[PDB]
Design a protein around this ligand. Structure first.
Ligand SMILES: CCCCCCCCCO[C@@H]1O[C@H](CO)[C@@H](O)[C@H](O)[C@H]1O
Ligand SMILES: CCCCCCCCCO[C@@H]1O[C@H](CO)[C@@H](O)[C@H](O)[C@H]1O
Ligand SMILES: [Hg+2]
Ligand SMILES: [Hg+2]
Ligand SMILES: [Hg+2]
Ligand SMILES: [Hg+2]
Ligand SMILES: [Mg+2]
Ligand SMILES: [Mg+2]
Lengths: 261, 269
């Protein structure tokens, strides 16, 4: 398990098309999970799952645009649920769950597609891992440093202190990351002023992005999003903070770093 | 009680709207307005709660501006309007199984209503204020012709049992009424100025989508209302029906139309 998860992912950031393939895979998984909490029903799950997985490809390769395939994946989904679900108050339930999967999971995750394209495969790996880096440092400095509850009563506990730490761990992960990456080739990287914010957002977003998921799970009755990968936890669980991050990161990058060819 | 309250609104609705397609910024302001209304309605079915409604309402109304003026991009503000919304519901709603209910309703509002309707923003920009008005009215045009040729030309049920009556026949008619509305629309508009219009091959499809989309777009809304228990989305405008009700098929149309235009007409700026 754990020996390949880290490098398999990374080795994917090589091609734009490789990136797509990873995002696609992750979406079938994460998507399957979030949809399965609303459907234990045979076909239902699968169709909407396929939709959730198609976006990266349609967005990146088919249309060189995002909004166009987003609208039709939604439209195709609702059409389907109208055909299949004949109880109207229920057609609403599947569309609601599919609606969250589409925005939260699918739309938000495929934000790597433009982050990669417009900011170099480099910063892509940077954003992704900076969440892993924040995550560790948030845990450690959280256990031994305080009880200031920012997390809700239903969500797994989180501290202001744990975040201020994970913040710093990202702040540092970048000095290190900068040097190593401007070296290995003349590679594009997060400049020095786009540092403090990029940390701040990986901080604040992963926090909110996980709390939102935990709330999402208390509604479906579980403490795990689902079991797809034999690894520890669920696929949606290993992603949750990353979802809120990517979008906010891409915004932060454009505001503070311009563009590429 | 006067006959000037029901007629004055019937006289301005049509031209007020049209007179807006003049500026890109005017278009934005109409779309913004319509979203606060339509949005207020769809959210209100899930919330009879004081603040809740209003916050998410404002979010749903902001997208057109943020998308058109602030970011010259769509996806960026879409993601943050959602994120700002969920953050809010986490703060306010403390029951997790309920935070899910408001996010679900807000989620449909965002995509269906807000995202779909503001598609006029790019349709206008990339296809000329002309075709914008063309798409919008072509739904009004399809709507009439679908009603008439529907009453007297058939009873083959395409519409669901909870949904207002619809027939394959009524659509094949509204299809044609749009097909024709364009010959007419083309001539008048290539005349009044050297104006950009739906070419002749982009005709058959544009009809087909206004047909098929308004159909699905209304059925989805009707299903949406059966869940909330009403036969009207809400009463905002004193006019007949609700604001969301006058738009429902238009939502599914705009997106699909924009796609269809790009596939078939390039960037006729
Ligand atoms: C397309 C970009 C998105 C990539 C998604 C791949 C998710 C792989 C899971 O990662 C794992 O998540 C844990 C939980 O945080 C970390 O502790 C651990 O070190 C890391 O190996
Ligand atoms: C850019 C969005 C434009 C907003 C359009 C909706 C608000 C105007 C509604 O007016 C009426 O709508 C009814 C719906 O079919 C028809 O009875 C009639 O044709 C039309 O006069
Ligand atoms: Hg790989
Ligand atoms: Hg810089
Ligand atoms: Hg106007
Ligand atoms: Hg033409
Ligand atoms: Mg997490
Ligand atoms: Mg209608």
């Amino acid at each position: 398990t754990a020996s390949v998860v880290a490098p398999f992912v990374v080795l994917c950031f090589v091609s734009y098309e490789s990136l797509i393939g990873l995002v696609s895979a992750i979406l079938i998984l994460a998507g399957y999970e979030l949809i399965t909490l609303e459907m234990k029903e045979r076909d239902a799950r699968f169709f909407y799952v396929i939709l959730l997985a198609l976006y990266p490809v349609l967005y990146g390769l088919v249309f060189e645009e995002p909004t166009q395939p987003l609208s039709i994946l939604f439209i195709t989904g609702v059409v389907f649920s109208l055909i299949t679900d004949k109880d109207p108050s229920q057609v609403f339930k599947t569309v609601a769950a599919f609606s969250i999967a589409l925005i939260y999971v699918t739309f938000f995750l495929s934000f790597f597609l433009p982050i990669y394209r417009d900011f170099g495969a480099a910063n892509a790996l940077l954003v992704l891992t900076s969440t892993w880096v924040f995550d560790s440092f948030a845990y450690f400095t959280g256990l031994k440093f305080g009880r200031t509850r920012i997390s809700p009563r239903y969500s797994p506990r989180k501290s202001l202190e744990g975040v201020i730490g994970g913040f710093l761990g990202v702040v540092i992960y970048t000095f290190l990351y900068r040097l190593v990456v401007n070296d290995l080739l003349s590679v594009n990287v997060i400049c020095f002023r786009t540092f403090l914010p990029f940390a701040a957002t990986v901080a604040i977003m992963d926090t909110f992005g996980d709390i939102f998921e935990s709330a999402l799970k208390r509604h479906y009755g579980v403490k795990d999003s689902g079991k797809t990968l034999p690894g520890h936890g669920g696929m949606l669980d290993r992603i949750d903070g990353l979802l809120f991050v990517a979008p906010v990161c891409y915004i932060v990058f454009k505001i503070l770093e311009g563009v590429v060819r």
